[PDB]
């Protein structure tokens, strides 16, 4: 409640917890080229005339899905360029001291981007002899995707940057985190502990120096309960964990929709070219034929105008993350939402099957108590000496200094306040006078 | 009975025989062909997607698949001419044959943590002013297509 | 349907380890059905005497895309005679009777249920071990209790499980010649007898009618176990029947003898979409009918019998015009 | 019976336009509770 | 009967789709612009959203005036100056 | 019914291509209204 | 009627005869032959 007095009411809590928001950026997509003669004609020269007379559709085909997987390699050699550090500090065990950086830690990839992968369901990509496999093994799953491509003749190619790089640049982020944000700018790194950067952070937001030293052990402790719960994280509740999935989905469904396109008879007697040909007379086979050939043409055209939209929003998105990089994880971020909910303190990034998972840690006001406020102090005897809090305000206890995130009050002193020009909302004191007005 | 097995796809996937010995049925599979060609050389190396080298200098089997008559580099560059997917790069000589670059991972400066109260600070002395270029497309070319003529070629049965 | 009953694997293609959506003939979900149940007849001690039966023959029901038995429903389990209330015997498994007419006969009483021109009749023969499938013209015979024959509240072939039925000595034609009695065979296109092994298992009978011929599907021959229906039997009849008639059985045992038989229960086909559930087997143990309500049309949308939670939704709803409007010019 | 022989096109139309009304229901509800404030101060007539 | 001649509310009953409703009740999201407009007044006192003090509106005013760089003397002897644009600007917004 | 099917395919291909023209639409139309949204959330914490 | 003027054109394409202000293309002219030219040699 507002008070009708030059005394204002603050609402400041007594106690704090840590809490870790989850974020998911999809930055990639699976890079997807189709080959048009096998998949509209199925090897059969008299589609392939008839396809001659629409036009050259099989060569644009193949040019246009080249054109967005190549789009896709810039986008990722762009992103990964910004999230490396200039200079970063060597990861060792026990990195973070009190903290426990131990999931983040590379075990290589960390245990925790080790985990969301295993927790995530994908198709086993098998690059490197995929083909050998799905006829030796069969179907991988049923209706696998890998081997119905090899089928179709469609191929999924593989990402711009291999598992190792991609950890690699993650881990010198991981190290750089403490030494970039102590100091403006990137020109200089200091290499400083973990635990240090997070009680400078903590300056930042407005808890006390005094406050942070008696509190350390039990800030650690927090910020340690906060990892664990992010370890266990990983849910069908969590909505950052279902949006990896739903990348994945959205990539297998593309894959699915030439299997059963292909099926789809179109009007055609039959989904084979071939089984028409034994059917029907080649004349009347012609006309089957060629609704097959229209089925097919508008089902690859549709499926890269989808690969064209789908790699346009995951370049905008992979700009989002490297904005989200450099504003969050490589410095604390004043703006609010932005990062984690409450007031940011520091995040982590560790990569993802089409795109980077963002881990922010946040700090959370509780139990809030009024307590009675004075915007400014101005000595009776003097009108013009006067002094306003800095990251603080004034509070009856008789006036003290807390600390804007953590209530604790304590003397007022002239490192706590601003000298000010004298105001009329600014109470005058004749008692007690605090030292930087003592003039 | 039914002898004749399909999948959900509706492909047939099985078959039963006269004998009564079942065989699976896979249709013949495509080997999935692309060309990795630079035009200072006007030189291609042909690559195969998935495809164990058993099917295809010789080939050289690689992480992201098989590529026919690959010699490998042994070095490493963090520049890439071609990318060929994972850490694989597709370099030309120069004209010879292309070479196999893995991409190498640029190191950052390692300045190490002191137990101490005193901390190691990495500090430039000299410093270099560079201008980086970005363009942003604020307008297209504005397009107003007559529908009537292009449909119909001014024909009246059309319209 | 989520137990596969009335369920006909498709005659094409067998689907192994994969849930899809098949249009087929096939029984409603939650439909009772019609049911007949075939009662000894009255008897005096140790012999047998009038016949006792609903009069099924009288009743006509559409032939309609054909209709699946359900054979032993009860059998196996305690029971009562039907004859009786007082009689208790354990239920046995009995075998239906069914004749089909493209047309229907006027009786010189007048009774319904005598099929004109040439009629379907598929008779169990033997006690059940064969059944007897023929296309033929049906003549009354004017003796007394025939239909032709003054005094017949109906027809019903009858067998003795005393004599008919002996280890010694079995009649495979004893239930074919009652048959003659009621009705005489004249110009029959075909005979046909499919030899069915004696079981107390739940049995599924089948009949539709397709350009090729009319299709037998018997649950026994290929999944008894599963209770799905497999052809066994193939008839050349070329005429589309509209009518068809069940044909009451009365069994001849001893009033002591007198035992209970389990129910049969016919249930139309209709064209329906299906989503199957098919085992590595390939037999179907689990299925959805979209017609039966919201639920069951969300499972076959989705195609899912087990969704993850959600609102979806399903087809409108939509009315249907009670009759035709017609207007006049002036 | 002709769309059949396409495919099952009424069932993927309905799941398609249920999951976009889905997604902005979601939308809507992470925007609300970025704008919603931990603390606030009661509006009064005469405020200001 | 429909409320408009050709209602596309109509249209869509005859064709048979719907038009669902919106997650939130008019009523709940008024609720949510309400709190917005009274944390507005003193939300913006330091960094950092752990605290919430409860200052007058035109109290912020006067602090973001003075942030911009007009100077604390001249705020003061405008107080009245300053309201009364801010009120014509707001009038002008009624009939925007 | 041979060339009732004809007649009748336009009118299913046509309804068809709308309902996938609508479905298409109303997913541009949501993912627009999402990235809206967002900068909403943005200009509430940054402005108001 | 659309013949008779562009603005008449404007007004059939909108299918509004008030529209709002605004600048609207229209079917372009299209240029008619007064002549038909028959090189062949037969």
């Not at chain 1, 704090?16 to 974020?23: A, M, R």
Request: charged share 15%.
């Amino acid at each position: 409640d507002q008070l009708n007095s030059s005394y204002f009411k603050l609402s400041i809590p007594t106690n704090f917890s840590f809490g870790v928001t989850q974020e998911y950026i999809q930055t990639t997509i699976q890079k997807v080229t189709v080959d048009c003669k096998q998949y509209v004609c199925n090897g059969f020269q008299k589609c392939e005339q008839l396809l001659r007379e629409y036009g050259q559709f099989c060569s644009k085909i193949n040019q246009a899905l080249h054109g967005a997987n190549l789009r896709q390699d810039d986008s990722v050699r762009n992103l990964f360029a910004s999230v490396k550090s200039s200079q970063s500090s060597p990861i060792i065990p026990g990195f973070g001291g009190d903290f426990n950086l131990t999931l983040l830690e590379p075990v290589a990839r960390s245990a925790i981007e080790d985990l969301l992968f295993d927790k995530v369901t994908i198709a086993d990509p098998g690059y490197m002899q995929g083909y050998d496999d799905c006829m030796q093994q069969g179907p991988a799953s049923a209706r696998d995707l890998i081997c119905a491509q090899y089928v179709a003749g469609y191929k999924v190619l593989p990402p711009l940057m291999d598992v190792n790089m991609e950890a690699a640049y993650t881990s010198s982020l991981l190290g750089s985190i403490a030494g970039v944000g102590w100091t403006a700018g990137l020109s200089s790194f200091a290499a400083i502990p973990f635990a240090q950067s997070i009680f400078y952070r903590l300056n930042g937001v407005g808890i006390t120096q005094q406050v942070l030293s008696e509190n350390q052990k039990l800030i650690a402790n927090k910020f340690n309960q906060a990892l664990g719960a992010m370890q266990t994280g990983f849910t069908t509740t969590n909505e950052a964990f279902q949006k990896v999935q739903d990348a994945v989905n959205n990539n297998a469904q593309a894959l699915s929709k030439l299997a059963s396109e292909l099926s789809n008879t179109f009007g055609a007697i039959s989904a084979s070219i071939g089984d028409i040909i034994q059917r029907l007379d080649p004349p009347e086979q012609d006309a089957q034929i060629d609704r097959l050939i229209n089925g097919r043409l508008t089902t690859l055209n549709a499926f890269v105008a989808q690969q064209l939209v789908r790699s346009e929003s995951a370049a905008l998105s992979a700009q989002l993350a490297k904005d989200k990089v450099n504003e969050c994880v490589k410095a604390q971020s004043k703006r609010s939402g932005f990062c984690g909910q409450g007031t940011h303190i520091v995040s982590f990034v560790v990569n993802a099957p089409n795109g980077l998972y963002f881990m922010h840690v946040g700090y959370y006001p509780s139990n809030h108590i009024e307590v009675v406020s004075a915007y400014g102090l101005c000595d009776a005897a003097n009108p013009t000496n006067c002094i306003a809090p800095v990251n603080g305000y004034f509070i009856k206890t008789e006036w003290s200094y807390t600390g804007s995130s953590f209530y604790a009050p304590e003397p007022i002193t002239s490192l706590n306040t601003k000298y000010v020009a004298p105001q009329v909302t600014y109470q005058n004191i004749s008692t007690n006078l605090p030292p930087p007005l003592l003039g | 009975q039914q002898r004749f097995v399909y999948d959900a796809y509706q492909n047939l996937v099985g078959y039963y025989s006269d004998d009564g010995n079942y065989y699976c049925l896979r249709a013949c599979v495509s080997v999935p062909v692309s060309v990795i060609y630079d035009k200072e050389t006007k030189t291609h190396a042909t690559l195969f997607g998935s495809v164990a080298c058993e099917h295809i200098y010789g080939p050289l089997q690689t992480p992201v698949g098989c590529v026919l008559g690959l010699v490998n580099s042994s070095l490493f560059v963090e520049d890439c001419k071609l990318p060929l997917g994972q850490s694989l790069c597709a370099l030309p000589d120069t004209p010879g044959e292309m070479r196999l670059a893995s991409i190498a991972f640029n190191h950052p400066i390692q300045v190490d943590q002191l137990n101490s109260s005193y901390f190691k600070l990495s500090i430039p002395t000299n410093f270099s002013f560079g201008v980086t270029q970005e363009y942003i497309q604020t307008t297209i070319q504005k397009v107003t297509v007559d529908c009537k003529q292009y449909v119909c070629n001014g024909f009246q049965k059309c319209e | 349907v989520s137990k596969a009953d009335g369920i006909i694997y498709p005659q094409g293609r067998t689907y192994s380890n994969i849930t899809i959506t098949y249009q087929g003939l096939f029984p409603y979900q939650g439909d009772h059905g019609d049911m007949y149940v075939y009662s000894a007849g009255h008897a005096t001690g140790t012999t047998p005497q009038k016949l006792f039966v609903a009069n099924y023959s009288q009743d006509v029901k559409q032939f309609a895309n054909g209709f699946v038995v359900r054979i032993g429903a009860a059998a196996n389990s305690t029971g009562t005679v039907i004859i009786s209330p007082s009689t208790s015997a354990t239920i046995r498994k009995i075998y239906p009777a069914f004749m089909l007419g493209s047309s229907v006969g006027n009786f010189s009483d007048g009774k319904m249920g005598r099929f004109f021109n040439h009629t379907l009749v598929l008779l169990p023969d033997g006690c059940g071990t064969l059944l007897r499938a023929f296309y033929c013209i049906l003549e009354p015979r004017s003796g007394n209790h025939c239909p032709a024959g003054n005094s017949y509240t109906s027809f019903a072939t009858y067998h003795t499980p005393a004599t008919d039925c002996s280890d010694g000595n079995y009649n495979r034609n004893a239930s074919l010649n009652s048959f003659k009695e009621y009705f005489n065979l004249r110009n029959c296109t075909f005979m046909y007898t499919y030899n069915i092994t004696e079981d107390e298992i739940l049995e599924w009978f089948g009949i539709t009618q397709t350009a090729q011929g009319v299709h037998l599907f018997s649950s026994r021959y290929v999944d008894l176990y599963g209770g799905n229906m497999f052809q066994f039997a193939t008839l050349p009849v070329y005429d589309t029947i509209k009518y068809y008639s069940i044909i009451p059985h009365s069994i001849r045992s001893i009033q002591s003898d007198r035992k209970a038989w389990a129910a049969f229960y016919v249930y139309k086909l209709q064209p329906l979409t299906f989503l199957l559930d098919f085992s590595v087997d390939g037999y179907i143990r689990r299925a959805i009918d979209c017609g039966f309500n919201d639920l069951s049309q969300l499972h076959c949308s989705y195609e899912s019998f087990d969704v993850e939670s959600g609102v979806y939704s399903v087809s409108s709803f939509e009315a249907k015009p009670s009759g035709s409007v017609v207007e006049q010019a002036e």
